[PDB]
Amino acid sequence: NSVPGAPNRVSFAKLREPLEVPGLLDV
Amino acid sequence: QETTRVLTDAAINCRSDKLNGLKENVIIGKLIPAGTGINRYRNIAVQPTEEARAAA
Amino acid sequence: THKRRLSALGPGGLSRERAGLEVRDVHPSHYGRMCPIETPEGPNIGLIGSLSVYARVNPFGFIETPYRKVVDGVVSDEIVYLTADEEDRHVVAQANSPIDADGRFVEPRVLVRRKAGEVEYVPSSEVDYMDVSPRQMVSVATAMIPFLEHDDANRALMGANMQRQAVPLVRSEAPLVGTGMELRAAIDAGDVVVAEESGVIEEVSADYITVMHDNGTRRTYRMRKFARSNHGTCANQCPIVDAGDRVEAGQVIADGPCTDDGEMALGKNLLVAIMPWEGHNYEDAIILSNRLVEEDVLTSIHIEEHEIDARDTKLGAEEITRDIPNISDEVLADLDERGIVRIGAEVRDGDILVGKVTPKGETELTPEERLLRAIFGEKAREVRDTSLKVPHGESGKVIGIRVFSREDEDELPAGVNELVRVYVAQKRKISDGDKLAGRHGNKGVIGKILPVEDMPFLADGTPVDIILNTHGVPRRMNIGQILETHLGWCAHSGWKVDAAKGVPDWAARLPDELLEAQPNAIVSTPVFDGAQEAELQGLLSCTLPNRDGDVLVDADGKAMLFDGRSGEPFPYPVTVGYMYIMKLHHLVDDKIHARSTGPYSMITQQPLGGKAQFGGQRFGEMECWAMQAYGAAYTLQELLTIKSDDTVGRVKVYEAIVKGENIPEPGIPESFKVLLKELQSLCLNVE
Amino acid sequence: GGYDTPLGITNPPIDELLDRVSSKYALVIYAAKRARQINDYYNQLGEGILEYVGPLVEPGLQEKPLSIALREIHADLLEHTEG
Amino acid sequence: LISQRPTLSEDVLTDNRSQFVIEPLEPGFGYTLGNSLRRTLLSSIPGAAVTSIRIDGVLHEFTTVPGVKEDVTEIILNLKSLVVSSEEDEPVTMYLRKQGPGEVTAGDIVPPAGVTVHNPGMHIATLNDKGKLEVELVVERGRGYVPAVQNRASGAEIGRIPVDSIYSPVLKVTYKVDATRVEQRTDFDKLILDVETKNSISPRDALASAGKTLVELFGLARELN
Amino acid sequence: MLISQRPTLSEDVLTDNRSQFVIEPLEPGFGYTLGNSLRRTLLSSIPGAAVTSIRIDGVLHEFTTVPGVKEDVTEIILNLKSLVVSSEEDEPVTMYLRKQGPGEVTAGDIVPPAGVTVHNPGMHIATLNDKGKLEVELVVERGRGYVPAVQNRASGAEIGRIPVDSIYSPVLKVTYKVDATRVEQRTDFDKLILDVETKNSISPRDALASAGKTLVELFGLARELNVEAEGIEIGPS
Amino acid sequence: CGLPKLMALELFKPFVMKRLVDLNHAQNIKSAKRMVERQRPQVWDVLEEVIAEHPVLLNRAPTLHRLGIQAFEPMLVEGKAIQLHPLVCEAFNADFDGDQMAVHLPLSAEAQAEARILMLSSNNILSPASGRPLAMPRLDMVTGLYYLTTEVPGDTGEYQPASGDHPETGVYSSPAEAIMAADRGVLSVRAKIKVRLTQLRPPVEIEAELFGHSGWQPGDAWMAETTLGRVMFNELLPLGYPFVNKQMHKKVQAAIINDLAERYPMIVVAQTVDKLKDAGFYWATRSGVTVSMADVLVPPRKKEILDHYEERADKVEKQFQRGALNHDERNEALVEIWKEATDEVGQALREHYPDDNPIITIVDSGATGNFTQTRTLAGMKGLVTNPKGEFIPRPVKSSFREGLTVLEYFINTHGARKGLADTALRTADSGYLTRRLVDVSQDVIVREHDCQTERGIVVELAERAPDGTLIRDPYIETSAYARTLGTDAVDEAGNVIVERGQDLGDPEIDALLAAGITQVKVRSVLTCATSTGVCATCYGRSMATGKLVDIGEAVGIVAAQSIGEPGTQLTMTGGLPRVQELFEARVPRGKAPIADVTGRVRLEDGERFYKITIVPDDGGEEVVYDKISKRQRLRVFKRVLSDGDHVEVGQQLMEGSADPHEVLRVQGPR
Ligand SMILES: [Mg+2]
Ligand SMILES: [Zn+2]
């Protein structure tokens, strides 16, 4: 989630990660 | 290998080469000394039998 | 993927051979930092990779990595950006650990990475850092292959490097199944326009959109349409919203090429069986129904740009115009009034692109040509005909004309006064021979485009899409594709697990609202956090009929089918399902090429190699030594003389062919004599 | 032997064909010289007559002179010696 | 033996599709005849399709229309969805213009005499206030698929934009057999067949036509010898 | 639809009753569309007569023994099986084969009633050891295609009469394949090859026309809904 | 050979222009050329004739062996790809991943002849290196054939011979009879039957049985019990070939093909193989061998054996913790434990699967892949090696069907990338070695029919049995066949079974086995008396010709490529560098001493290595041997070396290998 135009794709997450993805271009 | 050092003392000996290998005829492009190259095949005589020449 | 790339070769870096093979290896410090999978499969393996996803950089040029420090049998929630060295100080177990819902754990004896990079069942008191998450050791592209933990790294890396070689189709549908990567990928991808400020839409266009910022202020967003990529692929941007809409900041507003509904899209979702059919699916041979072709499901846009300059010679200034030397009129039809062709005109290889001309100078004409002029009243026109013609194997309309003129104050390089660049596109249908591949490394060329009717098909008359060969599967260790296929069939079908008597046990810990599924709903799996096969089996048991009472597939993922050729059912049920696939940037036309005779050398006497020009194929050391092995000598001699160096002999043989007469004899090679002169001039008595 | 019919480029069976030449090689050279003879025949047909004989078997509609030579060979109507 | 020829029975399913079954049949034959008709119907049915159209504002497939959201090629795929039946074989032409903000539906089209769409609800495009439309259409009877012919091969003007054609009145086919095959040798088949017209004609309409073409084929080998 | 090209039929005469057929060109690809169909047709389209179940004196339940002769029961059976003999009678015809003494029984040795017409009477079937006498009756009728040896119509009809198969197809062997003649000028039309071999009863030529008529009789069903429908016309011969 | 019409269109431009100006279609050549630019469809028509019967060449570099190119009959084809016959793919080692190829074109009549005879497709079937065929059927067609030849016990209406209530009810007078039956829903293809044949040569035994004189299949008549599958299979073959009645394994196939080539003419062989390919695809279609995850069973009792070996390793780890064993001790112990676990697991896995599993059935036929790939698929993967090369004591305990963990996958990556790195290095060294070799022997050609020498070597020839038989050596075909006796094989100190001057293939060899003799002075290149190269006689049969080679051959190069080709597959001194240094004539690392005279040994070992000396039998100087590393080991043979062991004059002292030079200087050339 956490995205405005996120089309609903259900996933099989058995876990829950604390952190989300970083800014890939920050490199 | 070591084309320079090979060639140099080769010419020093002034060894002429007989052109009888095959790589020779390769790089010179003249017909190879092998396969269809030898004289027994490359100098074949061929023509119609004069029997059939009677036919034609 | 090009960005976030890692390489040690370069200035300061080691050159290729100077490095030992060991640097190519995968040192255990690499874990979670450099994805060990993604790397070029050519002769640079181990030399270049990329970053793990959640990695991050030291100000000192190191990999500062987050970690979940655990304390007191309880994982904290403080991310810890760690380098590798300090990591050796410490004790890190795995994210996939039976945490007691609280940081507390379940069993004492736990896997953990050792300072030597080693693993043991640590008693569950000793660790001080837990993994931030699964897949912390994955690359970006690696992050985008479901079931990845079921197949070998070999085909894995193969599909990985291939997946960057995808080609943007014109329709750009999204896959039914995926990961969590497909959206974040695009939102960093950039080329999909993102909502800057939250707001209500103002007005759209096919080229831009007027946006109403929430307080007064507004803005447009110029869609990039038909922008030529660095590889001839189109770069359209279509808007995905309405002028009466309202969105929020950082939100998608228009997909890019390979983007569908905001997330990535690298192909289509296709129903396939796996039988060996007619041998046409022999050794990666890949068959195709015409249905996609006539449905344009595989349709590429290509943008080839051509450019030519306006130099100035000693003979004067180069010229561009409809005025030409000896030439037809119809060939001078679709030009503009002043040389160059007209926008929107169809073209074909060899056709004229731009009418350009320069003086050639003066030479005594042949008496013959002079005679033709006399009988024909034809002038000299010493200015030489130097126009622009389309090279071989090219067609399609010309979109836009880019024109530059020194007279226009267009800054141009010296010895130049006018520049023009041209844009032709050709809507390439898919065609046989082209290379496709799933997301598993499982790949291959297009075997044969078969019509729709002559096709194995369902009991519902629904024809199959394609067919792959089972025999490539085992020895390649790529069951993940089978997994994907089963999953995709389940996804297209939709289910509704009857949780009437509690829950079927496999569904017990399964997340809710998976208990049914609308057909053709989209889903995804984390790489290491994917569905189990038992879960999939319980799903496949629940496969609600499509329209009629229709359980097309068994509980085993197969089904009975009909040969559109034979008429009969096949003797067995067959694996089938929906797979997502890509199209590679190795089209047939990019590779197909032959030649008889073209522009000879300048240094040597030799008609130019290189498929950019004609070019052709070099018959060197491997099949020479070979021909000698065969014993056939004359063919080799002909190749190495009259196709290689005999200046006179070349035109001689050409004449002889034109006249229908026995071949002349092979003359002396040219490079031979050249080497001879060289040896001479080396102060060497030669004879 | 009773096996099958050949087809086009494989006609006639080289299995049979080698049965009269000593080696494949002399066969090849034999054929090539005859074929050049044939081509010279056609080239000289426009001009005056010469001892250039052949073909003997009725040549096909559009047949390679090589092919014609081969077929006459299997017909066994020639004569040759090594070099 | 069985002294009777079979019988062609009918079952209506819907307008756009219905069922057919026939018997008595010979054992080990129904699949044969069924794939026969399937291979037939899927391709050998004369249809009628748009050929290639033109609009004033455009020069080629790879441009835009002022005012619309969609583009040329988007409209291309949309129109490729279209359905229409001709009556004659000479190339007739329909047209379409439009103005103001709005949707473009299939019903929007001005058709010439003899032509008729069969799903006016087919969305085409949407426009704005500046949204302005004109278009001419090239349509013709045919059979099967053709790729778009080259306009250079033709002589038409640069506004022309060739489009592939799929003369498929048929939508989808399938069936199943009925192995009577009792243990008395009083055995026979029964083809549980289904048809799916794509809004152009009725299943029987396409079916009898196909059978006529088949009779064309067989008689060639029937009595010519 | 205008045919735009007209396929052709040139039968090939192989060995006597093994004639061959070829046809082209084709709308790619009708070969699979129809050759297989016609195959199964000729396999199961034309009537034919054949033995139903013979009865033999003496032997009661031991299905393997034959005194006075050399061949066993089943050899007799199979030899019977390949008997080309016809009749105009849509009924169960019975028959007789009778002889004593040593020697051999063959095809023509039978007593033919009305309608029966053996097409290879100079065909050995059975041998006679030493003075042995046989009197066997035969049950032939006619039908189509080919049947397994049907089980007992009754529970047990008679201890003597014993079932057999019935090769009601006068055709014997059928095969084919598809081709791609003239793929550029004809834009990949197709060429059918047809290998048929049948008994001396009729010519494969004739059987071909017969089965073709039968099939068109079938497809008249298909056409007889809207004969006023656009069909792909071939034009005249 | 397939061909993009567009391509060849550009190819024969000179030919086509000539032939068309021959027609009244282009006034000058220039008209022809621009017309080519215009492609007026009759251009395609004359293109047809000009393409008619003109050979071509086809190249997939890199080439290793002689078949890197051959000659094919072109034929215009739609599309823009190179349509290739299936069977040549194994020759080119050319998958359909998208590898390109090159296509050359001969011009002279002489070049055309060279192609049309030598470089032809059909003329090249067998291994020029190893005599066996190369267009032999494979994975998919082989699959179909295996399905076709297997027999289904308890199948659809089998031949069930049971009178008293019905006939045997499985007999069929004609194959066509059975055809019609199984075409009806009557018979499975693999149900056993008893039909009577008249058109196929039965086996030698029964055929001689009925006849003895002439089993000739067009008109003879005879019965047999098989399935219709084997029926049709034998039907494919030429008439003269007798019946088979077996389940065609790939090996069986190869043997059959070898027989055919060795006895019949080529053109029959090619046609036969083609029909094979065709029907093979036909039935591989029907085999229905596909792969669902439900097709992949796992070891149902795996976990308990897992636990057994785990308890073992646990005790081992505890005892290492004891310090009773050091680090590497417990390492190797774990290595052994997990290897044993792997072995037992593969045992249970192999026994567990039913036989109809296509997953197994592939390797079962021997189409491809090994059982280890199976175990990796389902069950447990086991050990992943140190990227250095050592083994990781973890190890993997799952198969792909279970899916790995992060750590497991990471571990497997080590050996994965290591192997893929080695892949290029090995093929690189291969070409280097090849260049060395062929540059060595570039000028070795036959020049003489016979050197007429009488030197020649004798062969072990299927060593005697101690219980007493001529138990066949394994490595005889690679040695005995295509050889020329200079001697004459007498029999029983009597009649000569076989004399000087024969080719020494199968039947005579078999007769020699019957005779009971295991030594044969055969000619060899080593004894080819010719000065300038070799004689035809001492060379023997060509592996590819099947007959005695002509005198125009440079066999040296063929042998060169013969060696160089397999070098790619040489998966590791114990490998490729071993081979090199052998050809290098170097003093190997494992230089083991060799005897210099017979006698017992003055075997003796100093500190930290061995210190030995020869017991001379002349006698004289006990040949002393001093730096005998304790890491070295006494050469075991006959029992391992022991002190006072009477040895020979050239017996290798230690294990390993001394240089070729000293073995020369001791026991000379031969
Ligand atoms: Mg490859
Ligand atoms: Zn010798």
PDB file of N, CA and C in Angstrom, chain E residues 186-214:
ATOM      1  N   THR E 186     -24.911 -51.856 -32.579  1.00  0.00           N
ATOM      2  CA  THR E 186     -25.888 -50.849 -32.966  1.00  0.00           C
ATOM      3  C   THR E 186     -25.348 -49.486 -32.553  1.00  0.00           C
ATOM      4  N   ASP E 187     -24.143 -49.177 -33.017  1.00  0.00           N
ATOM      5  CA  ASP E 187     -23.353 -48.102 -32.445  1.00  0.00           C
ATOM      6  C   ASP E 187     -23.197 -46.983 -33.456  1.00  0.00           C
ATOM      7  N   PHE E 188     -22.905 -45.786 -32.965  1.00  0.00           N
ATOM      8  CA  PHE E 188     -22.870 -44.630 -33.838  1.00  0.00           C
ATOM      9  C   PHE E 188     -22.408 -43.433 -33.031  1.00  0.00           C
ATOM     10  N   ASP E 189     -22.223 -42.312 -33.711  1.00  0.00           N
ATOM     11  CA  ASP E 189     -21.801 -41.107 -33.023  1.00  0.00           C
ATOM     12  C   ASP E 189     -22.938 -40.097 -32.971  1.00  0.00           C
ATOM     13  N   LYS E 190     -22.682 -39.014 -32.242  1.00  0.00           N
ATOM     14  CA  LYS E 190     -23.628 -37.911 -32.099  1.00  0.00           C
ATOM     15  C   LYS E 190     -22.820 -36.680 -31.709  1.00  0.00           C
ATOM     16  N   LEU E 191     -22.707 -35.726 -32.627  1.00  0.00           N
ATOM     17  CA  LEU E 191     -21.839 -34.571 -32.409  1.00  0.00           C
ATOM     18  C   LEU E 191     -22.555 -33.500 -31.608  1.00  0.00           C
ATOM     19  N   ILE E 192     -22.195 -33.396 -30.338  1.00  0.00           N
ATOM     20  CA  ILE E 192     -22.638 -32.253 -29.561  1.00  0.00           C
ATOM     21  C   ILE E 192     -21.790 -31.071 -29.981  1.00  0.00           C
ATOM     22  N   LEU E 193     -22.310 -30.286 -30.907  1.00  0.00           N
ATOM     23  CA  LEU E 193     -21.582 -29.150 -31.431  1.00  0.00           C
ATOM     24  C   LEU E 193     -22.180 -27.847 -30.930  1.00  0.00           C
ATOM     25  N   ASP E 194     -21.323 -26.840 -30.816  1.00  0.00           N
ATOM     26  CA  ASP E 194     -21.735 -25.490 -30.479  1.00  0.00           C
ATOM     27  C   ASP E 194     -21.105 -24.517 -31.462  1.00  0.00           C
ATOM     28  N   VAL E 195     -21.751 -23.368 -31.614  1.00  0.00           N
ATOM     29  CA  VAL E 195     -21.288 -22.322 -32.511  1.00  0.00           C
ATOM     30  C   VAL E 195     -21.364 -21.005 -31.763  1.00  0.00           C
ATOM     31  N   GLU E 196     -20.544 -20.048 -32.179  1.00  0.00           N
ATOM     32  CA  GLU E 196     -20.506 -18.728 -31.563  1.00  0.00           C
ATOM     33  C   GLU E 196     -20.261 -17.681 -32.639  1.00  0.00           C
ATOM     34  N   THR E 197     -21.339 -17.113 -33.165  1.00  0.00           N
ATOM     35  CA  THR E 197     -21.215 -16.020 -34.112  1.00  0.00           C
ATOM     36  C   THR E 197     -20.810 -14.763 -33.368  1.00  0.00           C
ATOM     37  N   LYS E 198     -20.027 -13.923 -34.028  1.00  0.00           N
ATOM     38  CA  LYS E 198     -19.654 -12.660 -33.415  1.00  0.00           C
ATOM     39  C   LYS E 198     -20.534 -11.518 -33.903  1.00  0.00           C
ATOM     40  N   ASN E 199     -21.845 -11.641 -33.702  1.00  0.00           N
ATOM     41  CA  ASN E 199     -22.793 -10.549 -33.906  1.00  0.00           C
ATOM     42  C   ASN E 199     -23.019 -10.232 -35.383  1.00  0.00           C
ATOM     43  N   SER E 200     -22.348 -10.931 -36.289  1.00  0.00           N
ATOM     44  CA  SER E 200     -22.541 -10.609 -37.692  1.00  0.00           C
ATOM     45  C   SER E 200     -23.728 -11.345 -38.284  1.00  0.00           C
ATOM     46  N   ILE E 201     -23.761 -12.664 -38.152  1.00  0.00           N
ATOM     47  CA  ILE E 201     -24.816 -13.475 -38.738  1.00  0.00           C
ATOM     48  C   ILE E 201     -25.205 -14.547 -37.739  1.00  0.00           C
ATOM     49  N   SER E 202     -26.126 -15.415 -38.149  1.00  0.00           N
ATOM     50  CA  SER E 202     -26.500 -16.495 -37.269  1.00  0.00           C
ATOM     51  C   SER E 202     -25.589 -17.691 -37.496  1.00  0.00           C
ATOM     52  N   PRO E 203     -25.510 -18.561 -36.495  1.00  0.00           N
ATOM     53  CA  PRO E 203     -24.721 -19.784 -36.643  1.00  0.00           C
ATOM     54  C   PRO E 203     -25.154 -20.593 -37.840  1.00  0.00           C
ATOM     55  N   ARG E 204     -26.460 -20.758 -38.030  1.00  0.00           N
ATOM     56  CA  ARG E 204     -26.931 -21.489 -39.195  1.00  0.00           C
ATOM     57  C   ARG E 204     -26.538 -20.782 -40.480  1.00  0.00           C
ATOM     58  N   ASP E 205     -26.554 -19.449 -40.467  1.00  0.00           N
ATOM     59  CA  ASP E 205     -26.180 -18.703 -41.658  1.00  0.00           C
ATOM     60  C   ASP E 205     -24.761 -19.028 -42.071  1.00  0.00           C
ATOM     61  N   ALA E 206     -23.826 -18.939 -41.134  1.00  0.00           N
ATOM     62  CA  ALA E 206     -22.451 -19.276 -41.474  1.00  0.00           C
ATOM     63  C   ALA E 206     -22.324 -20.754 -41.803  1.00  0.00           C
ATOM     64  N   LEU E 207     -23.098 -21.580 -41.111  1.00  0.00           N
ATOM     65  CA  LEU E 207     -22.888 -23.012 -41.159  1.00  0.00           C
ATOM     66  C   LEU E 207     -23.260 -23.583 -42.510  1.00  0.00           C
ATOM     67  N   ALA E 208     -24.438 -23.224 -43.011  1.00  0.00           N
ATOM     68  CA  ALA E 208     -24.856 -23.733 -44.311  1.00  0.00           C
ATOM     69  C   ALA E 208     -23.922 -23.242 -45.406  1.00  0.00           C
ATOM     70  N   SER E 209     -23.440 -22.006 -45.282  1.00  0.00           N
ATOM     71  CA  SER E 209     -22.468 -21.483 -46.236  1.00  0.00           C
ATOM     72  C   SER E 209     -21.209 -22.334 -46.245  1.00  0.00           C
ATOM     73  N   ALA E 210     -20.685 -22.619 -45.056  1.00  0.00           N
ATOM     74  CA  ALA E 210     -19.494 -23.447 -44.953  1.00  0.00           C
ATOM     75  C   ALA E 210     -19.732 -24.810 -45.577  1.00  0.00           C
ATOM     76  N   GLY E 211     -20.871 -25.423 -45.263  1.00  0.00           N
ATOM     77  CA  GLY E 211     -21.175 -26.726 -45.826  1.00  0.00           C
ATOM     78  C   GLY E 211     -21.267 -26.691 -47.336  1.00  0.00           C
ATOM     79  N   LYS E 212     -21.817 -25.608 -47.878  1.00  0.00           N
ATOM     80  CA  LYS E 212     -21.849 -25.447 -49.323  1.00  0.00           C
ATOM     81  C   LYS E 212     -20.443 -25.405 -49.896  1.00  0.00           C
ATOM     82  N   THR E 213     -19.554 -24.647 -49.260  1.00  0.00           N
ATOM     83  CA  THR E 213     -18.175 -24.613 -49.728  1.00  0.00           C
ATOM     84  C   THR E 213     -17.542 -25.994 -49.643  1.00  0.00           C
ATOM     85  N   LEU E 214     -17.871 -26.736 -48.594  1.00  0.00           N
ATOM     86  CA  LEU E 214     -17.345 -28.084 -48.449  1.00  0.00           C
ATOM     87  C   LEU E 214     -17.799 -28.959 -49.602  1.00  0.00           C
TER      88      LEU E 214
END
